[PDB]
Ligand binder design. Structure first.
Ligand SMILES: O=c1ccn([C@@H]2O[C@H](COP(=O)(O)OP(=O)(O)O)[C@@H](O)[C@H]2O)c(=O)[nH]1
Ligand SMILES: O=c1ccn([C@@H]2O[C@H](COP(=O)(O)OP(=O)(O)O)[C@@H](O)[C@H]2O)c(=O)[nH]1
Lengths: 456, 432
């Protein structure tokens, strides 16, 4: 028997990459997988990853979810990826005929986390076992579950909110300062969507999380014990979700540059796929990379959407300034293969925004991190990485979207990262645990086998 | 539900590639695949390829076949690849407990053509549907089945059901020589093809004309197993490397101005022929990618072309727009790869089924094959005669037109509603 599993996708490489990786993991574990795509994708990288997956995995069927005519003026946010989520969610009642058509009959529908609220009833109407694909850390899933209860406890969310704490089941309490800045702003579409999704998480049969048990200490089995007692769906740790074979192009220009660099001497720098630094922070980060005295691979973005980042890096910095930076390290304003770079022996450290995929990729390849939170869940993710002993995260720097860090300060912490031996030692240790988790008899491999055997 | 299919592997890089490609094709068509391997492999290419398939297809399971001690004293031949076949066949009875142990329960056993006679009864014991993976052209397959009745009775010809008659001159050179281990197998196998459930041929309907349905109608009446057209067998994912030294060289060459020359993994040219093929490649005035199997002119050759004495990614070279033609030995795997990438080919048969394949290639309108050359093992060709033949190849526009036409016919065959896709789905919808 081979259980048929559907994947409901949403906007963003931060959501697509674990979706496609998990889809690949499923197919390699004797399951038939059907991914439900929507077009046109907000970014080009989204289109390529799907096509490459479908090319490398012909047995993965694609069914297109045609969304309703969307009026962006109705939505609160101006974020192209968030707007996409809502467009899908507003077309929720049309997924039902799409799913019934699918042959052979599905065993489970794996819903993307931003789409849980709107689409988990659709699975219930079809008596379909539904599972949440959570793309962030377990500590964030726990907050997003708890946050609806927290906001209901406040008369006014404006003034009564200083910097107290929000209690999390099984985790260290989260300060308001580590909470996604958009959460303070209820009546923001992102906030209202996550509040709804976190409320509906309990309606799913389980929650897929890109993590392994050794990463969080020994708190996960106890949490699930209490979750089962409280009638909540279990946390299903299936991470680290392995990168697909199409994510490895051995002949990339940045990879070839790395081959000429001393091992462990290069600082990889990136802030994800949907966020860009301010012009001032970009100019300062470039200054800090020169001051660091370390070889660096810097990935730059001036806009969120790659399609729209048409401006040459020259106009932002000046030809002279940019010409100077290229002398000290590799700089590219284009999509690069992150995990392929992270596995390169030349990379000794990673300056990241704190996105979970990047973080988990670094965990998987054993690269020490300097987490520089910019927005959203990156501060909560920062704290997870710090307690893991793999990364350092400068609380002094605050949020990147609201605080500016100058060149001298940036250069010193990169030095600290490059010479931080405890992070290096933990990196090798933590990587071997991640590998052991997906190997047969591993923690993650055990949970995935249990899921498939139930499907079936 | 996912049907579990077992692939019986034999030695031979020529036989391994279609097996590994059909194994992948099965997985991509929703089947669980278990390949039966034997170690140590004859060549590193086999070991490397098998490892790369297992590395890229974790869901495919490998169960090693441990064989009886071979007695290479007899050994009715000195060929390393053929000798292993008999070593596999001598221990055919030892497969039963292995195949039975395989879980989940198997739906079909795809057995490689050289071991059919010795392994088709093994499928009968397990109540398993048996399929033979034929690695050569359809014309060769009929010759293989019609040959045993023929020896039960030279410029003459052998009558072949469904095809043009084959001259004894195009028949494999070892076929005339009975008492050869190669022959004895082929005789036994050909008489045993009727015992199997289906013959899997790396081909599509359009390539052999509309004769395949008419044949299958006739085949069914006599109680014979059907011809299963599942071609072309597309190269696996591990069979493409974004940067190889040859690929980087092609990127500096004009579109379709390069002649690719390869004679397969098994065969090796004579020292005299290599020196003659070299001068002919210079005399052609063309760019060329030369694959050599076994100093003053070593520099001269590299001036207007590329020379390599190593395993290359053939299918990736043939996809490249810089390659305008293919000087091939005529191996059906190499031939079908040129069909897939629409590369017109100069067929130079050297041994075995290559004269037969050449006859199939000529009728396809995809290639030219020089009858004035005969067998490469039996004949030597001067540089002057070679160059003019390559020049005719590069300047043969009607070949290139039929080439581009056939690639579309081939590509449409594996697409949905295509020829090969239909027969494949029907097979798996019977297993089911
Ligand atoms: O230039 C880039 C930028 C992004 N990524 C990939 O995009 C994903 C982004 O994941 P993340 O958790 O950081 O989500 P995000 O912050 O981008 O929303 C990571 O897996 C990276 O490997 C990449 O390969 N190259
Ligand atoms: O230098 C080489 C020689 C062989 N091949 C591959 O090996 C297979 C050999 O198949 P063939 O029909 O020629 O069998 P052979 O005559 O070599 O035994 C072909 O598909 C080629 O793709 C290759 O990739 N590089």
């Amino acid at each position: 028997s081979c259980p048929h599993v559907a994947l409901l996708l949403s906007s963003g490489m931060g959501h697509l990459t674990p979706c496609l990786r998990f889809a690949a993991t499923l197919v390699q574990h004797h399951c038939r997988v059907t991914i439900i795509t929507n077009y046109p994708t907000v970014s080009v990288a989204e289109s390529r990853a799907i096509s490459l997956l479908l090319s490398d995995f012909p047995q993965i069927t694609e069914k297109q979810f045609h969304l309703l005519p969307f009026d962006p003026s109705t939505a609160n946010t101006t974020d192209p990826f968030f707007l996409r989520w809502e467009a899908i969610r507003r077309s929720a009642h049309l997924l039902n005929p799409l799913l019934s058509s699918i042959s052979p009959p599905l065993s489970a529908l794996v819903i993307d986390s931003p789409l849980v609220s709107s689409f988990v009833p659709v699975a219930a109407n079809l008596d379909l076992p539904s599972y949440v694909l959570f793309t962030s850390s377990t500590r964030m899933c726990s907050l997003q579950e708890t946050f609806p209860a927290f906001v209901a406890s406040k008369t006014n969310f404006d003034s009564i909110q200083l910097d107290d704490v929000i209690e999390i089941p099984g985790f260290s309490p989260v300060p308001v300062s580590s909470v996604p800045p958009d959460f303070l702003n209820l009546n923001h579409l992102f906030t209202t969507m996550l509040i709804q999704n976190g409320q509906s998480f309990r309606k799913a049969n389980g929650i897929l999380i890109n993590t392994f048990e050794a990463l969080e200490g020994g708190i996960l089995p106890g949490i699930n014990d209490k979750r089962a007692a409280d009638g909540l769906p279990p946390y299903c740790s299936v991470g680290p979700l392995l990168p697909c074979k199409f994510e490895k192009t051995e002949c990339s220009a940045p990879v070839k540059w790395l081959d000429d660099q001393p091992e462990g001497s290069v600082v990889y720098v990136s802030f994800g796929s949907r966020f860009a630094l301010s012009s001032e922070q970009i100019k300062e980060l470039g200054d800090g990379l020169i001051r660091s005295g370390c070889r660096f691979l810097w990935v730059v973005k001036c806009k969120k959407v790659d399609q729209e980042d048409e401006e040459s890096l020259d106009e932002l910095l000046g030809r002279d300034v940019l010409e100077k930076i290229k002398k000290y390290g590799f700089v590219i304003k284009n999509w690069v293969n992150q995990q392929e770079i992270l596995d390169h022996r030349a990379v000794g450290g990673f300056v990241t925004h704190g996105g979970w995929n990047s973080s988990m990729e670094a965990v998987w390849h054993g690269v020490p991190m300097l987490v520089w939170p910019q927005f959203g869940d990156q501060k909560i993710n920062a704290e997870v990485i710090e307690r893991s002993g793999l990364g350092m995260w400068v609380k002094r720097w605050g949020w990147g979207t609201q605080q500016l860090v100058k060149g001298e300060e940036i250069g010193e912490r990169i030095k600290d990262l490059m010479g931080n031996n405890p992070l290096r030692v933990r990196a090798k240790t933590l990587r071997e645990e991640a590998r052991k988790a997906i190997e047969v008899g591993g923690s993650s491999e055990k949970t995935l086998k249990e899921l498939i055997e139930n499907w079936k």
